[PDB]
Amino acid sequence: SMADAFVGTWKLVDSKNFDDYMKSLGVGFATRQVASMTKPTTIIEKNGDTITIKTQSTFKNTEINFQLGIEFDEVTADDRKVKSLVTLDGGKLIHVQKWNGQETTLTRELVDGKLILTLTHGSVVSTRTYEKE
Ligand SMILES: CCCCCCCCCCCCCCCC(=O)O
Fold it and tell me: For a substitution probing ligand 1, which of 60, 107, 116, 131 has the most ligand atoms within 8 Å of its CB?
């Protein structure tokens, strides 16, 4: 499936408005200070219909395991306890998180060999560019 092309190890090389995105979510000053400095590595694995996404950095590490279209519980890096759903739309992996009546969407797409992660919360949009190792 289109999800197979995402498999690999990816390193952050560019970031726009991630602090705005964290501030919109309610991430505090001290975590924002450090998180703005991180250049995470994301490792994406797929085993049959189970997809694993690890995000790793010197600050915080996260891991999620999911199947497309099946809701799962997630505890985000900023300790939101969210209900999450990931689906494929064309070539885009769309990850929607919901908590406390709020919602944010993390979209992953391959563009010219790079992984573009778009983070949307309300009107705030952050774009994170990852390069394959
Ligand atoms: C796990 C390393 C990420 C460092 C940031 C931790 C505090 C902010 C968390 C906000 C939501 C997570 C957004 C993911 C960003 C990404 O994968 O590049």
Answer: 60
Strands (E), 3-123: 8-16, 41-47, 50-56, 62-66, 72-75, 81-89, 92-99, 102-111, 114-121
CA 102 to centroid of ligand 1, rounded, Å = 17
The answer to whether 46 and 4 are in contact (CB under 8 A) is: yes
Task: Identify the domain containing residue 31 by its residue range.
Answer: 4-132
Q: What is the CATH number of the domain that holds 99?
A: 2.40.128.20
Ligand 1: centre distance to CA 76 (Å): 8
Resolution in units of Å = 1.7
- Technique used by the depositors: X-ray
